[PDB]
């Protein structure tokens, strides 16, 4: 109890001469509170149930009618040395590892590469589940982006970002903004549920740090009443995620040309939104306008850093795109 009061130091989050008692809900206006973020877990559980139903009953028949392999992976040819290496040394050999395996086994590099690819396919999930998951992600991202556009087109701070801080933190919470924030947090918690326990044969890497940071930001911006500037980020970062899933679906459906077109469009949108618009719009309204309108407050030094971190991550992703798109040309 006391440690929670220590963490929520009113001289750290809120600006100068502003206390949490000023943000208490009353009959005049409604302000965001931390207790409103507890519904996110039940809504995430409901979203996970709906996702399971959609994958098992809706996406699977469509994939079957789309000529998607309903069986599992293939069977690698038997080999004692290769099996021992796969179980002990590694599972995804590189060029040097392939050369070493060819030298040790006195076999061609192509045969060893094919055997290891078959073993990886055995360890990897089937195409049907990935197609269903991609379809669910595409539908959810499309709906989220459409709702974000519809909500933001009428807001006053979309065109003038300085309105995000003019009356901060004394800004009432509307139903649409609360629904948007709760939906985003619920989707991220649903992703956490599907990542942590649905299948433990996964990777906890960049996309998990990214998820954790996104949930961190959405929570500590909602509790700090920084909800007018978080909607811009949420709508900006969900614009390109609706095309990668379509590209994956096209790739799985043996549609190479459609996959290439969707992937190049996704690359263009991703680069433009997260390298051209983000640093000149969101970092502009966060680093400079907030400083000159709200003044210096400690929590600022936190939030900006995290945003910069996100930018760095997306820069890394740009690398992983810029080469692949070169192959797509």
């Amino acid at each position, epitope marked *: 109890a006391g440690i929670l009061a220590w963490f929520w130091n009113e001289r750290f989050w809120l*600006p100068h*001469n502003v206390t949490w008692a*000023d943000l208490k809900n009353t009959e005049e*206006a409604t302000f965001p509170q931390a207790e409103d973020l507890y519904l996110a877990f039940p809504l995430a559980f409901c979203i996970f149930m709906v996702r399971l139903i959609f994958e098992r009953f809706v996406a699977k028949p469509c994939a079957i009618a789309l000529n998607i392999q309903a069986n599992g992976p293939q069977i690698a040819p038997p080999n004692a040395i290769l099996e021992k290496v796969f179980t002990a040394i590694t599972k995804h050999p590189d060029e040097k590892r392939l050369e070493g395996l060819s030298k040790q086994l006195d076999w061609d590099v192509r045969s060893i590469q094919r055997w290891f690819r078959q073993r990886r396919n055995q360890e990897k999930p089937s195409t049907l589940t990935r197609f269903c998951e991609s379809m669910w992600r595409f539908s959810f991202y499309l709906y989220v982006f459409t709702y974000g556009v519809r909500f933001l087109k009428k807001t006053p701070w979309l065109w003038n970002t300085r*309105h995000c801080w*003019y*009356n901060y933190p*004394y800004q009432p919470l509307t139903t649409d903004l609360h629904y948007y924030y709760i939906l985003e947090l619920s989707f991220y918690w649903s992703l956490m549920f599907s990542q942590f326990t649905d299948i433990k044969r996964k990777d906890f890497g960049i996309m998990f740090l990214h998820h954790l940071v996104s949930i961190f930001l959405i929570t500590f911006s909602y509790v700090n009443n920084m909800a007018r500037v978080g909607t811009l980020v949420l709508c900006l970062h969900d614009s390109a995620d609706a095309l990668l899933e379509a590209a994956k679906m096209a790739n799985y459906a043996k549609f190479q040309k459609m996959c290439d077109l969707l992937f190049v469009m996704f690359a263009v949108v991703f680069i433009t939104t997260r390298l051209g618009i983000f640093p000149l719009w969101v970092l502009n309204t966060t680093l400079f306008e907030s400083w000159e*309108i709200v*003044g210096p407050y400690p929590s600022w030094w936190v939030f900006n850093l995290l945003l910069l971190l996100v930018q760095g991550l997306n820069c890394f992703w740009s690398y992983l795109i810029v080469k692949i798109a070169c192959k797509a040309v």
Partner: nanobody
Amino acid sequence: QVQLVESGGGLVQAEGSLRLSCAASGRTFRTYGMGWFRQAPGKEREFVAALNWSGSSTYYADSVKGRFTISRDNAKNTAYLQMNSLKPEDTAVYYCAALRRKAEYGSRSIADFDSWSKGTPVTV
């Protein structure tokens, strides 16, 4: 949700200087954006100046910008309006108001301000 009382009104010679004061009896004066309006003989009320709770951002009218300065003191729970190089057109009744917790910053309409006041006459 606050009570506003104005002072500093009176009659001064041409090209004079006046300092109108607007005081509130409450602890919530620091959480509202204050504003000053004028009402000349005839026509209707006109917007003069306004500012947010922190006082960092202030915005005036087109015809009064460069001569009027609006400021606030949250320690004393008061707002000040200083006039420089007065003109005969400035003779009017001045009213002190406040944004009603929902109107966006930059509003220049009568309906956006709830807590009005008696006002003071200013004659040049």
